[model samples]
Target: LPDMEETVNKILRAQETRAQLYKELEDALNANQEKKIGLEQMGIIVQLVTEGLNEVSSDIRNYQASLTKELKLLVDSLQEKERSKLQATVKLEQLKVVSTNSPVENTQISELEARLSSLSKEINDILQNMKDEI
Candidate 1:
């Protein structure tokens, strides 16, 4: 009877050790699962940051391109206006040297002078506007 009681006690101790081991295993598995979820959230955050950077880069590129195009157009227009003004000046000088005294010649000289003044005013206005924008 004493031997039987000893054997029973040994069996109960083994069961208790098994239960503790199972609890420890479950806790370890749940901790690992939480780590996996944390890693997934980190991945999502990294992706979001990447997209934001890419969008900002694209905006910069677009802004630079548009500004460059606008600058080229402004230069081209200014150059054309300058060339026209010079041509008008040269023609006016030639007419003056002729000194025909004809009414038509006088009218053309007046017209050329007016055109020159207008072109100069337009150039100054554009420059003023640019300064104001700055």
Candidate 2:
């Protein structure tokens, strides 16, 4: 719960809805203007996306690490049978961790291009949304 609170505060501190940042970058890229953006400009957008991705990733990892530590601490006092069941219970979470709304269920995406493609479309959709903002 503390980690949840911390993570919530951490992102909330960014002072943006998080949606607006990339959405604006996406808008900038997709805009069909008298002066359209160049591929070089895309590097900035890519960096922004990459940086945000890493930020969210790290924050989640921190939260997960703490939460996992708490789980382990709790399980440490359990009996052999109970700990064994915890392992199976762990799989329930593993299952959730693995599957993250990809085209299929792998508990893991299992493909770099597939993930890249999914990310590609997500970014494209952001760009698409910006075009509509005009």
Model number with the top TM-score: 1
Q: Write out the backbone clash pairs for model 2.
A: 98-107
Task: Give all candidate RMSDs, comma-separated.
Answer: 40.4, 16.6
lDDT of 1 by residue, 3-108 (tens): 4334334333433443344344334333434554343453454355435434533433333332335443543454466557645754565566565879988888
Worst 10 residues of 1 by lDDT: 59-68
lDDT scores in order: 0.49, 0.42
Question: What's the lDDT for candidate 2?
Answer: 0.42
Q: Candidate 1: lDDT over CA atoms? A: 0.49
Candidate 2: minimum summed lDDT over ten consecutive residues — where? 74-83
Error in Å for residue 100 of model 2: 33
The digit string of per-residue lDDT tens for model 2 on 1-134 reads: 46644543443343243345546544644542213655566557656764764565454345334334443332232223222332332233334344666666653434533443454445444333323321
**Candidate 2 residue runs with Cα over 4 Å from true position:** 1-18, 32-35, 68-134
